[PDB]
Structure formats: structure tokens, C-alpha cells
């Protein structure tokens, strides 16, 4: 009664092993989550194609994942790949070669598919209401999801990822370069949402949610800026809330710092390279939709994959 799902991201891949409960009430219990530091982001060439060293790291990850699942009695791993392989021009070729080498097929899912599954992961992590808007900021893309208590009704994927924006708007040496990038990213967010007014905008009673790593880091940083302990000592950030004003203040702080300093802001360790652009995406998007406050969900794509499998 054990199931395994995995996602291939940009710099990390994760295997989730869960026990599937009696179908009557159903549900799942997470047995293990195993990370692989695939680091595909540093294995992308100038045209964005995955290098042979990237194929090797990916093949190595999926081989180890397959063994972990099999030794745990979980049978076969469903594997979905997101922005890294989606945007690589040779992503489909890499996926078929990895399948030939490992027997696992990393299916490259669309941004919208990722968003609809992530919404399921959020559903089982935090309490959804009758009108929810979810923003899931990844490396290449930002997914907007709207729905009710059960599933996504509307999904939009826009090319506003933390890595993609960091690259699209290179930061200069000047003291104002962080602010200038933040402003340019915000103008790009509004421009790509311009065809889509009303779709994800706050209505009375709309509740807003965030998922994935930037948002979790933001919640950790904001809580510690209110005097809290690091999330690692407080059991994580799932369910934490923060206001748009708190996000704006964290962004203004980050923008006046240089990249190396950003990685020393508590909560933002391991995200100094993209946190400026990523916070700029989140604030600009939330502001444009009229969000006042958000809840952060540690559940996301992998949990959603489980829910669909069950
Ligand atoms: Na995303």
C-alpha cells in the first residue's frame, strides 16, 4: 500500500514515498521525502540546453530514486519534470534518454498542469475556502490558480520565474541596481497580466495562498523580522501568514543589499542569487490582484501528484 512520486525541478529533485490508506476515507501518510541536489541549473548551456553532465546527474537521481522506492515496497515511481526540462530545447530528448538508461520517464508537464496539481498539494496542506487564488512561483514560471475547496477552476502560467527574471533583468553594479531590477520585474509582471484582468483579482472573501521555495523563504524571513525563531526551530512555515506590507518591507530591505548580503538575511539563505527578482515577482503579482494577506503552504506539486494517484 505504498506509492512513490517524484518531481525534477531545476536545482533539486525530490522523491516522496507515502502509504496509501484504506480507500474508504482514503488519504495518505508521508513515509519519507528524499532530496537529490541535481543542480540542473548549472548544467544548462548558453542556449539553455541540458549538458551531458546534466543528463548524467538526472539519470543518477532517477536510478537512486527508483531503488529507494523499490526497497521501500512502493513499486513504480511517477516522475514529473517542471521548468528546467520544460524550457530546455532538448528537454524531451533528455527525458527519453533518461528513460532508456533508468527505466523511469521524467514526464515534462506544462506550467498549467503543474499549477493544477500544486493546488491539490496546497489543499491538503492549508485550509482552502470558497474562493482561493494561489500563486506558485518556480524557477521558470509563475502559476496563477483560482478555485474553491476541492480543485482548480482556472489556471494561468506566465514566464515570470525567479531564475528567469533574475536572468532577464541583470543587476548592475550601482547602488540602485536592486531597486531598478525590482521595478523592471514589477513592470514585466503587470504587462503579462494585462491581457488577464479580473481572472485572479480579489473579490470579497477571496483568500490568497503561496507555495514553493521563494514564498517559504519569504515567510521565514518575515517571521524572523517580527522577532521569531528560524523556521527550522519552529517546525516549518506551513500555514504562516504575512501581509503585503510585510512583503514590501522585506523586498525594500533586499533591494538595498548586494547578492552576497541577501544570502545573509535570515530566512533567505540559499536564495541570495534570485531572491530579489523573486520577491519582486510575488509583490507585484499580489499587489496587482489586490491581495492584502497570504497564507503559505508547504504542500505543492509532489503532494498534488499523490492526491491524483490516489
Ligand atoms: Na511555478
Numbering used by the authors: 1 to 310
Question: Which passages does the manuscript contain on this structure?
Answer:
Degradation of polyP into phosphate is involved in phosphorus cycling, and exopolyphosphatase (PPX) is the key enzyme for polyP degradation in bacteria. The PPX hydrolyzes and releases the Pi progressively from the linear polyP chain. Bacterial PPXs share conserved catalytic domains 1 and 2 belonging to the catalytic N‐domain, and most members of the PPX family contain two additional domains 3 and 4 in the C‐terminal. The exopolyphosphatase belongs to the ASKHA (Acetate and Sugar Kinases, Hsp70, Actin) superfamily protein, which utilizes a common fold for binding and catalyzing hydrolysis of ATP phosphoanhydride.
We determined the crystal structure of the N‐terminal domain of DrPPX. Superposition of apo‐ and NTD structures of DrPPX revealed that truncation of the C‐terminal led to an enlargement of the cleft between domain 1 and domain 2 of the N‐terminal. This suggested that the C‐terminal probably exerted a force on the N‐terminal active regions. The result indicated that C‐terminal domains might “pushed” domain 1 toward domain 2, which was consistent with the comparison of apo DrPPX and NTD crystal structures. The root‐mean‐square fluctuation (RMSF) values of residues in domain 1 (1–120 AA) of the NTD were higher than those of apo DrPPX, indicating that residues in domain 1 of the NTD tend to be more unstable, which may affect polyP binding and catalysis. Moreover, the NTD of DrPPX exhibited a substantially decreased enzymatic activity compared to that of full‐length DrPPX. Compared with the NTD, the CoM distance between the loops in the binding pockets of WT, −5AA, and −8AA gradually decreased.
